[PDB]
Design a protein around this ligand. Structure first.
Ligand SMILES: Nc1ncnc2c1c(-c1cnc3[nH]ccc3c1)nn2C1CCCC1
Ligand code: NA
Length: 269
């Protein structure tokens, strides 16, 4: 393309070029094709629409993210404020999210579900085993990404959520802080697996978040759970979305499950 011949912007350090090639857009981000000028690898140049405290915590967040290298984590390269928008440079995932990828297909193949879910678990395991552990807290099919031509599946949007009761005057500061452990990622994984397995959004029968909350704090499963054909798939999902977090499967349990073991390849025909 002509568009690939002419950069339209450069990062402050000169490392990354932006091209006027729009790869995707959502409510929060617009992603362009970029280029790493040192390696000539194409990257994702993501533009997002804060106090000096939030600015410093962000830079520290980004420095840690730069160290997170793993085959099932979208790699994070750099970030800065441009003037106006915020720019994050990450690994480019050519096929967008798993949510969009699933819209092209009618019924899930067991080999694909196996393979995608195994990759997601390894990414979560990688995050949970950092020093200190990283809990994604926002895992969903719309921030799990895929490169069509390899079938590589990688967790993205890490840190994005945290980048954007009582009476406030009388509220102790520690009541704003939320601590989650690994099990909220396991629950979210279970719902991703359910969505992949049914080609259907979970709790779609609900109209609002409160209805889901009434269902989800009453511990009654989404209608799609029963539309799961394979009993072993139903059992894995059930073990991930159990209401009481101490009853939930662990990531290690899931990854050791024979369901996720790889096969011996497809026979030549
Ligand atoms: N790396 C990518 N490659 C290809 N497409 C991508 C992405 C991302 C994306 C993925 N992970 C990210 N982490 C912080 C910002 C960010 C942006 N978002 N998008 C699309 C833009 C909105 C729908 C998905
Ligand atoms: Na454009």
């Amino acid at each position: 393309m002509e568009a690939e011949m002419k950069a339209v912007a450069t990062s402050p350090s000169g490392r990354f070029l932006k091209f006027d090639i729009e790869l995707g857009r959502g409510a929060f981000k617009t992603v362009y094709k970029g280029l790493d000028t040192e390696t000539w690898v194409e990257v994702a140049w993501c533009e997002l629409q804060l106090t000096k405290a939030e600015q410093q915590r962000f830079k520290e967040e980004a420095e840690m993210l730069k160290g997170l290298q793993h085959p099932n984590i979208v790699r994070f390269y750099d970030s800065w404020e441009s003037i106006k928008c915020i720019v994050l440079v990450t690994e480019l995932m050519t096929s967008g999210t798993l949510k969009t990828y699933l819209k092209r297909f009618k019924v899930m193949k067991p080999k694909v579900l196996r393979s995608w879910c195994r990759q997601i678990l390894k990414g979560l395991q990688f995050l949970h085993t950092r020093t200190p552990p990283i809990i994604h807290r926002d895992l969903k099919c719309d921030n799990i990404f895929i490169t069509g031509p390899t079938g590589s599946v990688k967790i993205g949007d890490l840190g994005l959520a945290t980048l954007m009761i009582g009476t406030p005057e009388f509220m102790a500061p520690e009541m704003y802080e939320e601590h989650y452990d690994e099990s909220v990622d396991v629950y979210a994984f279970g719902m991703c697996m359910l969505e992949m397995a049914t080609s259907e959004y979970p709790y779609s029968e609900c109209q609002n978040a409160a209805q889901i909350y009434r269902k989800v704090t009453s511990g009654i499963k989404p209608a799609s759970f029963n539309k799961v054909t394979d009993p072993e798939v139903k059992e894995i999902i059930e073990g991930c979305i159990r209401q009481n977090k101490s009853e939930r499967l662990s990531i290690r349990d899931l990854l050791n499950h024979a369901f996720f073991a790889e096969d011996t390849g497809l026979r030549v025909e």
